[PDB]
Ligand binder design. Sequence first.
Ligand SMILES: Nc1nc2c(ncn2[C@@H]2O[C@H](COP(=O)(O)O)[C@@H](O)[C@H]2O)c(=O)[nH]1
Ligand SMILES: [Mg+2]
Ligand SMILES: [Mg+2]
Ligand SMILES: [Mg+2]
Ligand SMILES: [Mg+2]
Ligand SMILES: [Mg+2]
Ligand SMILES: [Mg+2]
Ligand SMILES: [Mg+2]
Ligand SMILES: [Mg+2]
Ligand SMILES: [Mg+2]
Ligand SMILES: [Mg+2]
Ligand SMILES: [Mg+2]
Ligand SMILES: [Mg+2]
Ligand SMILES: [Mg+2]
Ligand SMILES: [Mg+2]
Ligand SMILES: [Mg+2]
Ligand SMILES: [Mg+2]
Ligand SMILES: [Mg+2]
Ligand SMILES: [Mg+2]
Ligand SMILES: [Mg+2]
Ligand SMILES: [Mg+2]
Ligand SMILES: [Mg+2]
Ligand SMILES: [Mg+2]
Ligand SMILES: [Mg+2]
Ligand SMILES: [Mg+2]
Ligand SMILES: [Mg+2]
Ligand SMILES: [Mg+2]
Ligand SMILES: [Mg+2]
Ligand SMILES: [Mg+2]
Lengths: 52, 100, 38, 47, 95, 21, 110, 354
Amino acid sequence: SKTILVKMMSQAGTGFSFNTKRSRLREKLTLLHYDPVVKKKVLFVEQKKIRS
Amino acid sequence: TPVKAGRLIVEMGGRCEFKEVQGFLDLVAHKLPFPAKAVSRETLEKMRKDQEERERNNQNPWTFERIATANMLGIRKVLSPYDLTHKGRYWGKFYTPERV
Amino acid sequence: GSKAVTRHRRVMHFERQKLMAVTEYIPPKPTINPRCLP
Amino acid sequence: KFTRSRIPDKVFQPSPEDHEKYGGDPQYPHKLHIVTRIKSTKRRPYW
Amino acid sequence: VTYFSSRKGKRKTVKAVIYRFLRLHSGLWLRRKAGYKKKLWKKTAARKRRLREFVFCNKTQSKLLDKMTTSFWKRRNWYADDPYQKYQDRTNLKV
Amino acid sequence: YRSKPTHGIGRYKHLVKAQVR
Amino acid sequence: SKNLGGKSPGKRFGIKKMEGHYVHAGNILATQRHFRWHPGAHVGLGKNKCLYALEEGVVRYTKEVYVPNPSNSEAVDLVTRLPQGAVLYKTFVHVVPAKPEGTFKLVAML
Amino acid sequence: RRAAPLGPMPNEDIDVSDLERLKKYRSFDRYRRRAEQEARKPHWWRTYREHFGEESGPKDRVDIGLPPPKVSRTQQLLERKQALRELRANVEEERAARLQTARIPLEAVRAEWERTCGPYHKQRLAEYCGLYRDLFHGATFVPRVPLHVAYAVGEDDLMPVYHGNEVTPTEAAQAPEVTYEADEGSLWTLLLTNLDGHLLEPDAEYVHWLVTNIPGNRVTEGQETCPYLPPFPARGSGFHRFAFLLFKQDKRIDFSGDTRPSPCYQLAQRTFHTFDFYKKHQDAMTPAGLAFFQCRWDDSVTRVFHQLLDMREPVFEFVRPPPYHPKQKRFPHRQPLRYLDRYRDSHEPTYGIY
RNA sequence: GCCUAACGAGCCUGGUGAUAGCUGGUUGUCCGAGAAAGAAUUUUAGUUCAACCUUAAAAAUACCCCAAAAACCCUAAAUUCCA
RNA sequence: UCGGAGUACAAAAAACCCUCCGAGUGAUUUUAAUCUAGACAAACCAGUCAAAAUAACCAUAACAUCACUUAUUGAUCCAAAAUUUUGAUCAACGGAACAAGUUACCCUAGGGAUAACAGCGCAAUCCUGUUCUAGAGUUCCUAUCGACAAUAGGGUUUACGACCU
Ligand SMILES: Nc1nc2c(ncn2[C@@H]2O[C@H](COP(=O)(O)O)[C@@H](O)[C@H]2O)c(=O)[nH]1
Ligand SMILES: [Mg+2]
Ligand SMILES: [Mg+2]
Ligand SMILES: [Mg+2]
Ligand SMILES: [Mg+2]
Ligand SMILES: [Mg+2]
Ligand SMILES: [Mg+2]
Ligand SMILES: [Mg+2]
Ligand SMILES: [Mg+2]
Ligand SMILES: [Mg+2]
Ligand SMILES: [Mg+2]
Ligand SMILES: [Mg+2]
Ligand SMILES: [Mg+2]
Ligand SMILES: [Mg+2]
Ligand SMILES: [Mg+2]
Ligand SMILES: [Mg+2]
Ligand SMILES: [Mg+2]
Ligand SMILES: [Mg+2]
Ligand SMILES: [Mg+2]
Ligand SMILES: [Mg+2]
Ligand SMILES: [Mg+2]
Ligand SMILES: [Mg+2]
Ligand SMILES: [Mg+2]
Ligand SMILES: [Mg+2]
Ligand SMILES: [Mg+2]
Ligand SMILES: [Mg+2]
Ligand SMILES: [Mg+2]
Ligand SMILES: [Mg+2]
Ligand SMILES: [Mg+2]
């Protein structure tokens, strides 16, 4: 089994991209992270795939 | 199997005397690698209290215990740390009972 | 360099040989022989 | 490993014959040492 | 390091010094931590902060940089809005 | 420590065991 | 040959500060692999089980009783299996405070 | 190397062999009880109690107080037993205990507490707050008699003073009332003192009130020695402790050296040593009553300072020590750029020759 | 194989004072102090650091070090740190 | 290359083509922020902790957890992303951006720092002596031998060492 590296972008309108390992057979990921420019609890979605 | 000095190997019992048992056990004890003897209870206690009376009837004031434990003349540079326990009677695998 | 325990008797340092020689056992020797005492 | 040597306190307990042998006073200890080196520090440890 | 050049006969400098190092006027040399742009997803936040921190150079490295650096870069500089202008001088040094 | 008189004050494994005719 | 990977340097785990040493806030008093010295008063715990002084003062080493966290299942099970005369004893590192918390100074008389 | 222990091991009493026959506790609460019982014993090794300030450990407490009341133990036990049997005899008590709905008269509980164990509890509060340490040092007393202090704010508002309370000087600007039960056969002395708040001397205390030769309960009819003065703490240092002490005296004693004048606003005159004052008249007075309260700064302190004592009011501040820094190195290795900011004197650019 | 007495590729000149971690050599007198290896490295025939050592210069504590203290099944000679 | 245990028995350190286990990642949600005292460790590069101070949420709410938890990993430069990130059995794992065999046709600089011959150390192997009798010898240990074992000596062979050339 292999993992994939996915870039997560903010839904608060501000550009912030952070990378997360996620399992390949799983669906598209959506998490609750912290944005240091909004200082709020921000929903993040999977946007792009970078590294296998 | 490792065997130290003073370890009993074969222990025999019965209703007869020591003499024939010693007579056929000296041939066994001779063929062993370490030096060995055919001993009885009385013979073992005889040589042990003989060692004690020789040790307390030392005539010279200087002994291995007094020199090594007190570190006389810096002898610990030559002696081993095990020699504080061995008291000079043991050197390697060799044990000399005449040492005191 | 030899091991701590060998079979070739492990010939000693000369100061230790002097130590063994000065600390040999000497027996008590009585003044008059008890056999040809009365 | 050759290291320093601990000396037990039983060695420095004097017998009553030692004072008669070496001319010491059993009651009053003496005040000052005369110390004179006999041997060499070569072939002896750095401490 | 070219100690005597063939054109001018002067002592040259190595541009690999300038392209990653900063010299303060106290003799201290400033540099970045190694690997601060490599594999950020794998490292912790404290390790990321530690790699993002600026660091100083010790005696042997500072003397090596001073030996490989010509005397142009050791001059006193007064830039407009320089962030390191406050850090140029040394104070309260009791040695 | 070994040389201290307070050696073995933390000994507990001899009191709990965890490892018919 | 058959055995590989036996080369690894030491992690320098051990005792740093003794009893009687004067430390400040943040000084690592000891680092350890498993729990050998436990933190006591004014001694913090980092996630790599290192013991660091929380207040400025003198380090002490002490033997007291071990009353573990009830959320720690293996520890409370070890408590349950002890006989009635037995109590756990462990060692602890403390920092007695030297400086006071603060002083009162006259700043203005009105 | 092995050394011999100096005394018994903790776990050497129980037998290692035959572990199944030894009874086990299966309760973490049982271990908590056993460990808190074990931690209070004076072990021969180094302990937390030795290092972290047990305040000299065992102390021979000199008792300077009234005799305890002699109550017949067997009669007390039998009347308590009969009251308990008549209490369990009722069925409505069982109903109120079962259905989780029962109330107690806390005023009567407070009254019986004040009669029974209130003296010992107030003694341990005074020991905790250090009333004995800064007044009589190692000497201690049991506050045997009940004592009530109250401050009249207005028409109906009455603010009590119990042990360890907290009263603002706006409530305490006026003279309080003092209530205690006594027959007309004894003489009393009431003394309100401020233990902390002396400006020049750290070992001395202030008198805020003193009345002597009190006939029984009636405080007002007693002869007035020192006038009442409102509480004046500092603005910075808060929570000064003010203690009311009541002494029982046998003879009628008059003071010519302790007499204070009518206005008496001089803090040089208002300088007290309760230790030496009790040393002067140990044979007459025995301390029986005590009630003390904490007191912080408010706006009413300012008028007491300015109008009454003719003061410029001192203002203090809680100043922490400066943070520790090591010796500055000429070449710091692997250190941030802000390392120079720790040793920079002021955040102002200074130019020596330019 | 032979190509003017040496041919796995002639000889001469120039680059050329080719470059060698490899070998050899290194020239007057006297005095002071004086070093045997931890880390990397196409690196173990060498370098670059640290620990030591030399010449100057600032200071103030340095060795030796009684207690007390440094782990949990068993463990020696003994180590650390400190008046 | 990295980690665990013994070697390295009690602070640290500590090597071998020494003896044994592993690692080049999985599972889950608790998706794990910014700043800054003081420290451990270390040649350098790296690595580790971290109180106080801000913001997030119980409205005074910062350790991601488990699998022995320890190892689970790679430096500049350069490429692609573009606003902030990523890229190597660069595994010879402090890493040359990309390079194999053979030379008995060989050459040079050196090395006894390093092998083949001899010499030397040791006696595993080899060869001699003796101690012991179980057993062979129709009886019968020792006429002739003599299993399992012991002890001493020689330096003839093959090694092992790498000390003079
Ligand atoms: N992928 C990669 N290649 C690098 C890196 N640094 C230098 N290079 C070089 O960049 C080149 C990449 O071109 P490629 O060989 O992939 O066509 C190679 O010569 C490689 O050695 C790096 O960090 N990553
Ligand atoms: Mg034999
Ligand atoms: Mg050797
Ligand atoms: Mg290891
Ligand atoms: Mg190593
Ligand atoms: Mg009773
Ligand atoms: Mg020719
Ligand atoms: Mg040349
Ligand atoms: Mg070389
Ligand atoms: Mg000289
Ligand atoms: Mg150097
Ligand atoms: Mg000691
Ligand atoms: Mg010292
Ligand atoms: Mg250090
Ligand atoms: Mg915090
Ligand atoms: Mg390489
Ligand atoms: Mg390498
Ligand atoms: Mg490394
Ligand atoms: Mg041929
Ligand atoms: Mg040649
Ligand atoms: Mg050779
Ligand atoms: Mg060599
Ligand atoms: Mg040689
Ligand atoms: Mg020959
Ligand atoms: Mg040969
Ligand atoms: Mg030869
Ligand atoms: Mg050999
Ligand atoms: Mg031989
Ligand atoms: Mg036969």
